[PDB]
Amino acid sequence: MGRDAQRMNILAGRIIAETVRSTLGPKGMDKMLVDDLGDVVVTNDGVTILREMSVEHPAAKMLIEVAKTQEKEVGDGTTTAVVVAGELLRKAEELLDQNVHPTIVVKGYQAAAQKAQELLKTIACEVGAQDKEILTKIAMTSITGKGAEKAKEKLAEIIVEAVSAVVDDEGKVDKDLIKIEKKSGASIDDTELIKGVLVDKERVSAQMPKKVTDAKIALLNCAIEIKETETDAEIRITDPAKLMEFIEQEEKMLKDMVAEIKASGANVLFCQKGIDDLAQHYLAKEGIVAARRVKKSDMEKLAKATGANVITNIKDLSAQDLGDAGLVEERKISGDSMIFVEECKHPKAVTMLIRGTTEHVIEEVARAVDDAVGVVGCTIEDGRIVSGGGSTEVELSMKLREYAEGISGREQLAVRAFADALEVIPRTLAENAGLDAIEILVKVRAAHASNGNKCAGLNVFTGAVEDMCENGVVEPLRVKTQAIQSAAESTEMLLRIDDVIAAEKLR
Amino acid sequence: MGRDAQRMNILAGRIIAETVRSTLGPKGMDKMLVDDLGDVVVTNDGVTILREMSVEHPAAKMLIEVAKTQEKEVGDGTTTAVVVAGELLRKAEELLDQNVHPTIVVKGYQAAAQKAQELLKTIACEVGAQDKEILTKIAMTSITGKGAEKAKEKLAEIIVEAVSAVVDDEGKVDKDLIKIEKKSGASIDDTELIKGVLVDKERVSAQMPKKVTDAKIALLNCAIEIKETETDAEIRITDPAKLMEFIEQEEKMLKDMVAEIKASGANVLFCQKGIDDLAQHYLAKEGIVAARRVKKSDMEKLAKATGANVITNIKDLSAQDLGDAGLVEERKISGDSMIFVEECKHPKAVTMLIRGTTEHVIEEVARAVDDAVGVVGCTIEDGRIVSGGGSTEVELSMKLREYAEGISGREQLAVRAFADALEVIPRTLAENAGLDAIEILVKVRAAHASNGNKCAGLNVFTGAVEDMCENGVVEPLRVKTQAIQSAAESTEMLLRIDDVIAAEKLR
Ligand SMILES: Nc1ncnc2c1ncn2[C@@H]1O[C@H](COP(=O)(O)OP(=O)(O)OP(=O)(O)O)[C@@H](O)[C@H]1O
Ligand SMILES: Nc1ncnc2c1ncn2[C@@H]1O[C@H](COP(=O)(O)OP(=O)(O)OP(=O)(O)O)[C@@H](O)[C@H]1O
C-alpha cells in the first residue's frame, strides 16, 4: 500500500513533466494542439501547454497550479522549473529502491536549496542605473524561441528606449500600463512606438477635420442626448404649438452648449456612446474634433496622461475639467483606421504596434513583448545579472559536490542527487543540435575546474565553447532563484502523500 | 513518442500531397468527385481538389490553408507547390533513418531557398512595354489543361488586345473589374469582346425602341413610384371628389417629370426596381430607352465609365447628374436577351462572353480566363520572363550540387536533398506520356553541362528535346518564386511538431 500508490503518483507526474521538455531551447520543436470541435493551434512556449492539458489525474494538477503562481511573477522561469522538478522526481524515484523511505531526501533538498541560493548571490556583479549598452543584450536575448528570423535587431532597440523613461528616475515603483494590439497588415515585420494615445475605432461620416494644432481634450460621458435614460416625473401636453417649440428649443440648445465648450478652451470631443450625424455640422463650423465610441480601456489612459476629469452630466462642465493635447490625426494604416494623439503632457506609458503578414505572426509577437519587458523591470531594481546560457547550474554542481563532503550520514546522497540533477539544463539545450550529443557536457564540465573561467557556457549558434557575456546572453538571477524555489516546493508535495483515499462528501 | 507521432504526420500528408500529382501536366487525367446527395462533378485543376476534400485529419489542413493564401496571389503556382512540398517531405522522411532528428534539415532548406531565389533572378531577361509578339505566347500557353482543342489561337488574340489598354500607360496600378458570364448557346466555341456595357436582364413588354443615336444614360434609384416605402404622417379624407383629383394629379405629374428629364438631356432610363406598364407609353412618345431591374454589380460599372451620379429621390435631378453613351441595343443572342451599350467615354474595363454547346464547357472557360489574365498583369510590372516547361528546376539542380561543395557538415545532405527533389517536375510532366519513361530526364540532364544551352526544356507535343522560348512557352518567374516560398514554408510546419497532445478547452 505504501509502495503501490507512491510509484503511480510519480509515473503520472513524469508523463506531464517530460511533455514541455522539447520546448525549452531557442530552436526547439513546437506543439500542435487539437480540440473536439476542430481547432488546430500551434504553441511554442510551455505556459500555454500546462493550461490546455487533460488534468483528469490528481497528480497532474498540483504542479500546474504551482507553476501558474510562479508564472505570474516574472514570466520567464516556468518551463525550466517543470523540467527541473521532473528531473528531481526521476532521480528520487531510483533512490527509493534501497528501502530508505522518503524523509531524508526532503531534508537534503532543503539543505541544498539554501546553499544554492547563497552561492547564486555570490557569482553575480553590480549593474548600476547609468548603463545603457548592458540593458539591450537582455532584451535581445529575450526573443529567441518566438521568432529570431525577424526579431533580433529591430526589436532590441525600441524596448530599451521605451522602458527607460520612469524607471531610471524612480528605481522602486514602475508599474505601467502596456497594451499590445493584435492587428494585421501587409508588410513583413513593422514595429511602431507611439509616444501618445492610440484609439482603435473608426467612423462612418468622414466630414470632420483631422488636423488641429494645440488642441485640447475634453472628456464628456453620457447625459448629453435628448433621450438616453428614463424619467419618473411624467409630463403632459396641452397645445400642439408647444411640443414643437420645446423640440426646437432643445435642438437649438446644442448650439450654445457647443459654444460654451469652445469658449472654455476645448477642441477634442470624446464621448462614450455614439454621436448623431445632425450634431456634426455644429462641430465643423468651429473647428472641433468629433469622435465617438471610446472604450473604457482607452479612456482610462486620458486622466493620468493629459490631465482631465470626467463629467457625469452636461451642465457640470466649467474650465478646470479640461486637458491639453498636441496633434490629433486619423490615418488609415494597415487596413483599419486608428486615431493617434501625439504630444500629451506626462508620457507615463507607451504603445507598441506590430504589423505582420497573416494573423498568426502578430499573435506570435503578442506572447513575446510581455516576456521582454518583464526581464527589464527586474534588472534596474536588482542588478544581480549572472552568466546565462546554462552556466550557473554547471558552476553550482561543481561546488555542491565538494560541499556535501563535509557532512556524514544518509543526507549526502540527497545533496549529490540534487547536484547531479542540475545537469539536465545543458543536456536539454544541446539535444536540439546534432553535433553536441554528450561531448559538450564533458567539455564544459572540466573547463571550470581551474581558478577563474565562469562566464563560459554554451551557444547553439556556433558549436564550440566560449564566454556568454561577450555574445549577448545576460539572463537575470531572479528568474533562476524563483524557478529553483518552485522546483524545490513542487517536489515535496508528491513524496509526502504515500497513500491516497476517497470520500463522497464535498470539500 | 518522438518518432511515433512524427511518422504519422508525414504519412497523413503524403496521401493528400500525391492526390493532385496526376493533375499537373497539360494532358493529364481529371478527377471525379461525388457527394452524399449524388452530385458527380469533374475537376481538372488542383485548386478545387484542395477545397472539396475530407479535412478530418489535422495534418491535412495546414497545407491546404497555406495553398489557399498563395492561390489568391497570382493563381498559377498552386498544384506545383503542393507537389514540391510532398516531394520534399518524402525525401526528408528517408533522411530520418540515420538518427539525425529534424533541425539541420530546416537550416539547409533555409540556406538553399535564398540561393535558389538569387539564382532565379539571374537567369531571366528584360522585357519592355514596347513589345507585342512576346505578350501573346504567355496567353497562348496559359490555356493547356483547360481545353486546347478549341482554345489555342482564337483565345490568344483577344486577351492581349483587351488587357493592353491601361497597363502600358500606367505600369504600376491596373486593377480592373473583369466579369465572366456563364451562359450557353448553340455554336461550338464563340468568344465575344464587348467594348462597352453588358446588362443580363430581359423584359416582358416589347413595346419600346432599341436604337437611339448618341443617347444619354441617366441613373435613377428608387423614390419614384407612388408607393414604395412608408409614411409616418397619416392623412385623412373629407370629400370623395378630392381623393380622385389627387390621384389624377399624381398620375399626370409623371408627364412633366419625364418632360423635365427629356429637356435636361437624357434618353436612357436605368431603374433599380421594375417599371410599370402604364409608364411605358410616356417613354415612347419622346424616344427614351426604357429599362428595369438593374443589378448593383452592373450598375456600379456606370459611374466610372459613362460618368454620372445617383439620385436618392426624384426631385434632386438637374443637369450635372447625367452621363453620355453611344448605342443601346437589345438583341436576342444565344437564346437569352441581353442589353449592349456601345461607345461610352472611358473604356476602363472590358466584358468577355463565351458561348459553347452544353453547360459544362462554358464553365470550363470560366476557370480559364481568370488564370489567363493573372499571368499578364505580373508581366508588364515585372518583366523577368524565364524559360518555362520544367527548365528552371533542372538548371538550378546543376548549380546547387556544385554550390553545396563549399560547405562542410551535416547541412550538405539537406542541400543535396533539396536539389534532388527539384527533379520531380520533369518526372511528373513526362509521366503522362508513354515514350518518355526515364530517358528524357537523363537526356535533359547532360545537355546543360556545357556553357550555354539554357532555354531547352521539354514539350509533350513532339517527343524530342528543343528550345522552349521558340515554341510558345514563356512561364513567368513570380509564379515559380511564390511556389518555392510556399513549399519551403509548408515543409517546416510539420517537422517542428514531433509530439501532439489534446485538450477539452475551446481555443
Ligand atoms: N543564444 C542562446 N544561448 C544559450 N541559451 C539560450 C540562448 N537563447 C536562449 N537561451 C535559453 O533559452 C531559455 C528560454 O527559452 P524560450 O524563450 O524558448 O522558452 P522559456 O522562456 O524558457 O519558456 P518559459 O517562459 O515557459 O520557461 C533561456 O533560459 C535561455 O537560457
Ligand atoms: N507545351 C508545354 N510544354 C511544357 N510544359 C507545359 C506546356 N503546357 C503547360 N505546361 C506546364 O503545365 C503547367 C500548368 O498546368 P495546368 O494549367 O494543367 O495546371 P496548373 O495551372 O499548374 O494548376 P495550379 O494552378 O493549381 O497549379 C505549367 O506550369 C507549365 O509548366
Numbering used by the authors:
A (entry chain D), B (entry chain C): 10 to 516
What does the paper say about this structure?
Chaperonins are homo- or hetero-oligomeric complexes that use ATP binding and hydrolysis to facilitate protein folding. The group II chaperonin from Methanoccocus maripaludis, MmCpn is homo-oligomeric, consisting of two 8-membered rings stacked back-to-back. Chaperonins are further divided into two major subtypes, group I and group II. Both share a similar domain arrangement, in that each subunit consists of three domains: an equatorial ATP-binding domain; an apical domain that is involved in substrate binding; and an intermediate domain that enables communication between the equatorial and apical domains. By contrast, group II chaperonins occur in archaea and eukaryotic cytosol and have a built-in lid segment protruding from the apical domain that opens and closes with ATP binding or hydrolysis.
To assess the mode of ATP binding by MmCpn, we incubated the chaperonin with a low, non-saturating concentration of ATP and froze immediately. MmCpn was then mixed with ATP at a molar ratio of 1 Cpn hexadecamer to 8 ATP molecules and the sample was frozen immediately on glow discharged grids to stop ATP hydrolysis. Around 160,000 particles with good Euler angle coverage were used for an initial map reconstruction with D8 symmetry. Although the reconstructed map has an average resolution of 3.9 Å by FSC gold standard, the local resolution varies from 3.5 Å at the equatorial domain to more than 10 Å at the apical domain. After map sharpening, we observe well-resolved side chains in the equatorial domain, but low average density in the intermediate and apical domains. The high resolution obtained for the equatorial domain by imposing the D8 symmetry in the reconstruction supports the fact that the equatorial domains in the complex are relatively invariant in response to ATP binding, and thus follow strict D8 symmetry. In contrast, the poor resolvability at the upper domain consisting of intermediate and the apical domains indicates the absence of D8 symmetry in these regions within or among the MmCpn molecules, i.e., the apical domains exhibit high conformational heterogeneity in response to ATP binding. Reconstruction with no symmetry (i.e., C1 symmetry) from the same dataset of particles generated the same result as with D8 symmetry reconstruction. These results demonstrate that, upon ATP binding, the MmCpn complex demonstrates low structural variability in the equatorial domains and high structural heterogeneity and flexibility in the upper apical domains, leading to the apical domains averaging out among the MmCpn particles. Therefore, using C1 symmetry or D8 symmetry leads to a similar initial model of MmCpn bound to ATP, where the equatorial domains are well resolved but the conformation of the apical domains, which presumably undergo the largest conformational change upon ATP binding, cannot be resolved.
